Design a protein around this motif. Structure first.
Motif, PDB file in Angstrom:
ATOM      1  N   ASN A   1       7.119   5.473  -4.084  1.00 36.37           N
ATOM      2  CA  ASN A   1       5.910   5.271  -3.057  1.00 36.37           C
ATOM      3  C   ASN A   1       4.855   6.358  -3.429  1.00 36.37           C
ATOM      4  OD1 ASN A   1       4.272   5.006  -1.059  1.00 36.37           O
ATOM      5  ND2 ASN A   1       5.916   4.570   0.517  1.00 36.37           N
ATOM      6  N   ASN A   2       3.527   5.660  -3.997  1.00 34.62           N
ATOM      7  CA  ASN A   2       2.541   6.642  -4.335  1.00 34.62           C
ATOM      8  C   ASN A   2       1.483   5.633  -3.536  1.00 34.62           C
ATOM      9  OD1 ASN A   2       1.367   8.576  -5.762  1.00 34.62           O
ATOM     10  ND2 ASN A   2       0.461   7.165  -7.325  1.00 34.62           N
ATOM     11  N   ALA A   3       1.569   5.327  -2.297  1.00 38.86           N
ATOM     12  CA  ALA A   3       0.500   4.600  -1.734  1.00 38.86           C
ATOM     13  C   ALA A   3      -0.012   5.399  -0.602  1.00 38.86           C
ATOM     14  CB  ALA A   3       1.418   3.441  -1.032  1.00 38.86           C
TER      15      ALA A   3
ATOM     16  N   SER B   1       5.434  -4.085  -1.157  1.00 37.04           N
ATOM     17  CA  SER B   1       6.078  -3.747  -2.829  1.00 37.04           C
ATOM     18  C   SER B   1       6.719  -5.150  -3.368  1.00 37.04           C
ATOM     19  CB  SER B   1       6.958  -2.686  -2.593  1.00 37.04           C
ATOM     20  OG  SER B   1       8.382  -2.971  -1.995  1.00 37.04           O
TER      21      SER B   1
ATOM     22  N   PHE C   1       4.642   1.823  -6.320  1.00 42.85           N
ATOM     23  CA  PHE C   1       4.161   1.185  -5.222  1.00 42.85           C
ATOM     24  C   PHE C   1       2.821   1.813  -4.832  1.00 42.85           C
ATOM     25  CE2 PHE C   1       3.717   0.880  -0.321  1.00 42.85           C
ATOM     26  CZ  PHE C   1       3.090  -0.376  -0.598  1.00 42.85           C
ATOM     27  N   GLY C   2       1.591   1.344  -4.839  1.00 42.21           N
ATOM     28  CA  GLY C   2       0.250   1.729  -4.400  1.00 42.21           C
ATOM     29  C   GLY C   2      -0.329   2.040  -5.638  1.00 42.21           C
TER      30      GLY C   2
ATOM     31  N   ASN D   1       3.463  -1.413 -12.337  1.00 44.75           N
ATOM     32  CA  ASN D   1       2.142  -0.580 -11.961  1.00 44.75           C
ATOM     33  C   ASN D   1       2.266   0.871 -12.409  1.00 44.75           C
ATOM     34  OD1 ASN D   1      -0.142  -0.822 -10.350  1.00 44.75           O
ATOM     35  ND2 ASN D   1       1.061   0.466  -8.760  1.00 44.75           N
TER      36      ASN D   1
ATOM     37  N   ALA E   1       2.850   3.729   4.034  1.00 43.77           N
ATOM     38  CA  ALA E   1       2.244   4.898   3.226  1.00 43.77           C
ATOM     39  C   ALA E   1       3.260   5.916   2.888  1.00 43.77           C
ATOM     40  CB  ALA E   1       0.767   5.447   3.676  1.00 43.77           C
TER      41      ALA E   1
ATOM     42  N   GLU F   1      -1.995   3.538   1.620  1.00 43.61           N
ATOM     43  CA  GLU F   1      -1.831   2.811   2.980  1.00 43.61           C
ATOM     44  C   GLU F   1      -0.577   1.602   2.771  1.00 43.61           C
ATOM     45  OE1 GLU F   1      -5.573   0.225   0.987  1.00 43.61           O
ATOM     46  OE2 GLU F   1      -5.713   0.819   3.064  1.00 43.61           O
TER      47      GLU F   1
ATOM     48  N   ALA G   1      -3.256  10.242  -4.163  1.00 42.52           N
ATOM     49  CA  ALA G   1      -2.067   9.702  -4.708  1.00 42.52           C
ATOM     50  C   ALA G   1      -1.652  10.363  -6.358  1.00 42.52           C
ATOM     51  CB  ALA G   1      -2.338   8.233  -5.231  1.00 42.52           C
TER      52      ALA G   1
END
Lengths: 234, 234
Positions: free
Chosen positions: A52-54, A60, A99-100, A122, A68, A56, A76
């Motif tokens: 999780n690099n989100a 995913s 993600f993010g 990603n 987030a 908001e 991030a």
């Protein structure tokens, strides 16, 4: 759980959701933009793993809806560095998703890494390092495969990513299809910069031979073997 | 004789000495330092072939004692460019030696090149090009594999050189050991600069797949395939 975080201050929270998909709330990035995560075990199954690099909430690909990552403090990670600090080798049998915000992704495990049907989603660049990261006063200086004869294995089900791929190990044994924008494989006993420039090399006491079998689906492939006398078999 | 020079002004004198070794008195270099030699046939057998780039007499490895090449006008070639201008493919089954001053060496043959136990002696760089050189008003501008689907083949007995090696072809099929200081293999339909920078590429109408089987004995290997969709099998 295939991924088990270290108990210390670089251990991220790791949760299972759904039918076994792991979600890793990566640790707060430092001033270099590096999220440095440490693990007792790092293994991925077919349900995959999501980092999780989100900033908001959103959807995913592997784990459905996620909130987030509030560890990020509004910034991030530029690099998600995952370091195995135990003696356990890694087995990657599924997809790993950032993600993010897209980031560079590294897994280091000096005990060995095996990929078989693994992939990266990603990521601008993904690197598998059978070796250790190098630090000086908290700063990432590069990577080392010195004093190491262990193996990066790629199985028959291959490895896929739309981004850049680095494969770094004393030796590599690949038996499947590698798909990437570019493939860089650096073998032998080396020290590296952060960008995987080779800075120094050892001559192994016995041959460190690498084997690549199967297709490489990439427009640009570089293979550098610094073990003098050792070869690359195709 | 495996090597047959063109009748025209770029055809060098070719002689057999000894037990079949060919000696090529390469043509006078131009102002770019290029000795541009044209051939109806270019084939090398186990006795090998020697390209005389010498300013004074001496001992060649393959052909014994040779006199200087007086075509050189006191200036050795920087590049020995050998161009097949017929429809005949090339078969290289022995060593090719630059006698005298070390030079860069190129063989171009758009009809195909097969190496099987061939090699290069006293070359800084050797390049096999299944394609044509590009000229503009007598000046070498680069090379082309456009509009070509022919093969560079490397046989089970392999290819050896102490210098740099370039392998340039629409597709490559290699089955033996390639030994070189560095190996660069560029596949697909491309235009190149003199230094084999890729300047443009075509998408072939059908797949142009390359296959590399066997060892590569080199510390630096680059494989670039510009045929979108096509792969490199190892």
């Amino acid at each position: 759980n295939g991924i088990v975080p270290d108990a210390g201050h670089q251990g991220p929270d790791v949760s299972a959701v759904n039918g076994g998909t792991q979600v890793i709330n990566i640790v707060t990035p430092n001033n270099e933009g590096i999220s440095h995560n440490q693990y007792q075990d790092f293994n991925v199954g077919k349900p995959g793993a999501v980092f999780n690099n989100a900033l908001e909430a959103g959807q995913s690909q592997l784990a459905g809806h996620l909130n987030a990552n509030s560890n990020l403090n509004g910034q991030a990670a530029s690099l998600i560095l995952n370091e195995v600090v135990s003696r356990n080798p890694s087995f990657l049998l599924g997809q790993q998703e950032v993600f993010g915000i897209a980031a560079e992704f590294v897994l280091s495990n000096p005990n060995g890494i095996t990929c078989d049907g693994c992939g990266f989603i990603n990521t601008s660049r993904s690197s598998l390092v059978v070796g250790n990261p190098l630090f000086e006063n908290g700063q990432l200086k590069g990577y080392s495969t010195l004093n190491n004869t262990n193996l990066l294995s790629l199985g028959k089900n291959g490895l896929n990513t739309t981004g850049l791929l680095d494969l770094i190990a004393p030796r590599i044994d690949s038996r499947g299809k590698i798909t990437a924008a570019e493939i860089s494989a650096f073998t032998g006993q080396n020290t590296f910069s952060q960008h995987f420039d080779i800075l120094s090399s050892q001559k192994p006491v016995s041959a460190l031979d690498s084997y690549f079998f199967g297709s490489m689906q990439s427009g640009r492939i570089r293979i550098i073997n610094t073990a003098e006398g050792s070869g690359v078999k195709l």
